[PDB]
Design a binder for this molecule. Sequence first.
Ligand SMILES: C[C@H](CS)C(=O)N[C@H](Cc1c[nH]c2ccccc12)C(=O)O
Ligand SMILES: [Zn+2]
Ligand SMILES: [Zn+2]
Ligand SMILES: [Zn+2]
Length: 231
Amino acid sequence: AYPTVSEIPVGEVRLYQIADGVWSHIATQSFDGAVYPSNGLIVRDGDELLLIDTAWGAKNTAALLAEIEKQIGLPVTRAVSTHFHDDRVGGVDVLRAAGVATYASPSTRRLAEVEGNEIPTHSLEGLSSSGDAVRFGPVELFYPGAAHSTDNLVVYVPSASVLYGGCAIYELSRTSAGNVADADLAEWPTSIERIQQHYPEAQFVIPGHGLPGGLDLLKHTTNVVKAHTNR
Ligand SMILES: C[C@H](CS)C(=O)N[C@H](Cc1c[nH]c2ccccc12)C(=O)O
Ligand SMILES: [Zn+2]
Ligand SMILES: [Zn+2]
Ligand SMILES: [Zn+2]
C-alpha cells in the first residue's frame, strides 16, 4: 500500500494518510545515476496545515502544493525543514513565493548558506542543546543531538502517536550506511537513545527515505551505524 520508486515518476508526488489529520508526502529524484524516494509530513492545524520538509526540488515542491490543494483543500501556512540538505530545503523558494512561512533552526540556516542551498526565512528558538524540545502548532520539535547531520531535528504528533525521524532514522530494508559525509558517527547511537527515551509511546515511525514501521527502526539504525563504524 505504501508507494515506492517504481510507482512515482520523477516530478510527481503522492500523499499517504497515516492517521486522522496526518499524512506523509512521497516524491522521487535522480541522484548520481539512480532514482531514490523521499518522505515528508503534513499535519492538520485547525483549518490550516503544517508542512514538514520540501519534496526535494522546485518542480517536485510545486507538484506537492498542487496535490495538497486537490486532495485536502486547506492552506499550507507554515513549513519546517529538519536539516540543511536539498531533500529538506530544496523547494523553499517555491514555498516562499506561494506565501508559506518557512522555518528552520539557526544551525540549519547557517549550514544551508555555507552549502549554497536554499535558506528558510524564520529561525526556530529553543533547540540548541541535545534533548531540547519545543511545541510548534500541532507538533513537538526535538533536537536529539548530532546524527545524520549536526543539525537534524525529529518531529512528534501527540494526537496520533506519529514519530517522524527524518534522515537520522533508516528504513528496515537498508542494511548499509548511505550518505554519511556530514554525519557524526560517534554520537549517532547516543542521539537515537535520546529519541527512544523521549517518545516510548510512539506507534508509527517514519524514516526520511522508504517504508514506515514501528519503534524497531531506532535500534535498526543503531545496528547499521555501528557496523559502518567498524568497517
Ligand atoms: C540527497 C539525500 C540527502 S539525506 C541523500 O543523500 N539521501 C541518502 C538516500 C540513500 C542512500 N542510499 C540509499 C538506499 C536506499 C534508499 C535510500 C538511500 C541517505 O539518506 O543516506
Ligand atoms: Zn541528509
Ligand atoms: Zn535524506
Ligand atoms: Zn535491523
